[PDB]
């Protein structure tokens, strides 16, 4: 039941152009509280446990 389907070879050109507006953007990450290193902006980690309280491990 294919009522509507493309009608003209999409054009690489365009095609991609389409796929164009797309793109990524590296994690905004920051740097350790005292953990020293780069963490997920706002969180402890396999480097932390801190923040202000030792709520983790390592």
């Amino acid at each position: 039941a294919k009522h509507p389907v493309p009608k003209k070879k999409t054009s690489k050109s365009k095609r991609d152009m389409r796929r164009s507006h797309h793109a990524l953007t590296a994690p905004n990450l920051t740097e350790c509280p005292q953990c020293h290193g780069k963490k997920l902006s706002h969180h402890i980690c396999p480097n932390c446990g801190y923040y202000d309280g030792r709520q983790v491990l390592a």
């Binding site: 797309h22 793109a23 990524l24 953007t25 590296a26 994690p27 990450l29 780069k38 963490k39 997920l40």
Partner: protein, 108 residues
């Protein structure tokens, strides 16, 4: 400068593509946290192909850090021609478009 790679790599060439297209030409160590703490799969992978990269060099291609990725790319090939529901009559297979993964690591 040296380089990392690996074909017969199961994964969305495309997806992959975004991968670098980021950490792309940039400080080692640096992105080394991009893919460490970024998201979408590939990463993991991507990471990998950076370590035997940073390695290979220093080890046999030689000045650490001062390094990075003058360039990085991925290619597709080998497919995985995959069979699916017979048009409920005729076959409809997709293709997990295998995936290559090269990437430079030269020193500042």
């Amino acid at each position: 400068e040296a380089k990392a790679i690996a074909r017969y790599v199961r994964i969305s060439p495309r997806k992959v593509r975004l991968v670098v297209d980021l950490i792309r030409g940039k400080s080692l160590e640096e992105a080394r946290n991009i893919l460490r703490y970024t998201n979408k799969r590939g990463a993991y992978f991507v990471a990998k192909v950076l370590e035997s990269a940073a390695a290979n060099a220093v080890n046999n291609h030689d000045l650490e850090d001062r390094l990075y990725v003058k360039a990085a790319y991925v290619d597709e090939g080998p497919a995985l021609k995959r069979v699916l529901p017979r048009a409920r009559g005729r076959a409809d297979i997709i293709k997990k478009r295998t995936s290559h993964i090269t990437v430079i690591l030269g020193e500042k």
